[PDB]
Amino acid sequence: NFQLRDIKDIKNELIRERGHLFYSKEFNEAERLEEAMKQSFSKKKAIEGNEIALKVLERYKTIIRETREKKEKTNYLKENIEKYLNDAEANEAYIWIPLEIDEVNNLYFEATRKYKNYDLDNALDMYSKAFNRAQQAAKNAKEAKALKETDERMYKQLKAL
């Protein structure tokens, strides 16, 4: 099981991940319930307080578990965006599809502004759009490149032979 200290520690960790900022509503709610538990204990009702305390622990654990989950998903999308933007830049993307590359850089930027305003959910949506368009960008860069190689390789033969 657990004790009073257990909450101190979980709550400390949650603050350390800025859980209270990413989920300020659910954090106000768990803090209101922590008060209730404190009244219980001070009014000498250990069973009632302990019954509330098991909940406060789980309300606090949810906030970190989900903060962590989306943090990890967020920086997976980030690393993959840079990976496919590389693959696209390697395939002449600033020749054939430069404005497609700008859109991605812009989506990624605006997603980071959302992330910094502690809006994990909308931040993740725009990082997912940016991801989808990095994939699409990498593809269109290859297809475009391959097309140019074919057209100039025909056209060399025609104009001489």
The resolution, in Å, is 2.8
Q: Which two tokens stand for residue 41?
A: 């204990």
Q: Say how far apart CA 119 and CA 102 lie, in whole Å.
A: 23
Q: Say how far apart CA 99 and CA 107 lie, in whole Å.
A: 12
Q: Say how far apart CA 131 and CA 124 lie, in whole Å.
A: 10
> 3-class secondary structure for the chain?
CCCHHHHHHHHHHHHHCCHHHHCHHHHHHHHHHHHHHHHHHHCCCHHHHHHHHHHHHHHHHHHHHHHHHHHHHHHHHHHHHHHHHHHHHCCCHHHHCHHHHHHHHHHHHHHHHHHHCCCHHHHHHHHHHHHHHHHHHHHHHHHHHHHHHHHHHHHHHHHHC
Question: Considering only CA atoms, which of 134, 120, 138 is closest in space to residue 70?
Answer: 120
The answer to whether the beta carbons of residues 135 and 84 sit under 8 Å apart is: yes
